[PDB]
């Protein structure tokens, strides 16, 4: 069968891109990355989950 051709990408929650204070784009993506990866620590519970899923 071919019916179900596409079925899913019909019923997709349409949903929107959201506007932003954009991301800076070069040198400067170094000074910004650097600060996060680790210069204020950042977090000290073993190591660093780079992007934590809300527990």
């Amino acid at each position: 069968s071919l019916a179900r051709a596409g079925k899913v990408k019909s019923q997709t929650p349409k949903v929107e891109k959201t506007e932003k204070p954009k991301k800076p784009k070069g040198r400067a993506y170094k000074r910004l990355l650097y600060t996060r990866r680790f210069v204020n620590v950042t977090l000290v519970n073993g190591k660093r989950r780079m992007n934590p899923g809300p527990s």
Partner: protein, 179 residues
């Protein structure tokens, strides 16, 4: 037809691509020394990897043979002129104990920083792209320049430039033409 003009890439990428190993020592580099893309850490990496063998190549001639000394004493003095390795280390030998990180200090990008004339590393750079800094009376607009030791003391700010002369600088032909 004409003499087909000649060119080698400078870059030599890595053998493994991804690593939370070597990666998080580039971002410790960029960063600390200004830089930009990974297409710098890998330029250098090449040019050290270049020199490195002309030592290996030699060492394996005897010692004393014409070729070995000449390059060594010509090889070396090319690196004394760029500050790279000291005076006191040059036996040959030894150039091998030169890691990436020594070269970087002799990039203009940063030699400015040290000659402070720059808030942080950044205010060290726009400062090069924007025609601002100068060696003789001559501008240089490119971070990667490589400091020739015996210049260094001649590093400016030029006549042209706004921070040492010819005029105020655009935004000033504005606070004086609205009171």
């Amino acid at each position: 037809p004409r003499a087909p003009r000649t060119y080698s890439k400078t870059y030599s990428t890595p053998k493994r691509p991804y690593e939370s190993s070597r990666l998080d020592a580039e971002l410790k580099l960029a960063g600390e020394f200004g830089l930009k893309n990974k297409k710098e850490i890998y330029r250098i990496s090449f040019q050290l990897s270049k020199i490195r063998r002309a030592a290996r190549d030699l060492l394996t001639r005897d010692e004393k043979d014409p070729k070995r000394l000449f390059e060594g004493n010509a090889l070396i003095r090319r690196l004394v002129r760029v500050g790279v390795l000291s005076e006191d280390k040059k036996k040959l030998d030894y150039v091998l104990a030169l890691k990436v990180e020594d070269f970087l200090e002799r990039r203009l990008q940063t030699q400015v920083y040290k000659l402070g004339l720059a808030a942080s590393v950044h205010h060290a750079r726009v400062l090069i792209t924007q025609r601002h800094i100068a060696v003789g009376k001559q501008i240089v607009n490119i971070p990667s320049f490589m400091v020739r030791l015996d210049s260094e003391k001649h590093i400016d700010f030029a006549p042209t430039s706004p921070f040492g002369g010819a005029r105020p600088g655009r935004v000033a032909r504005r606070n004086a033409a609205r009171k």
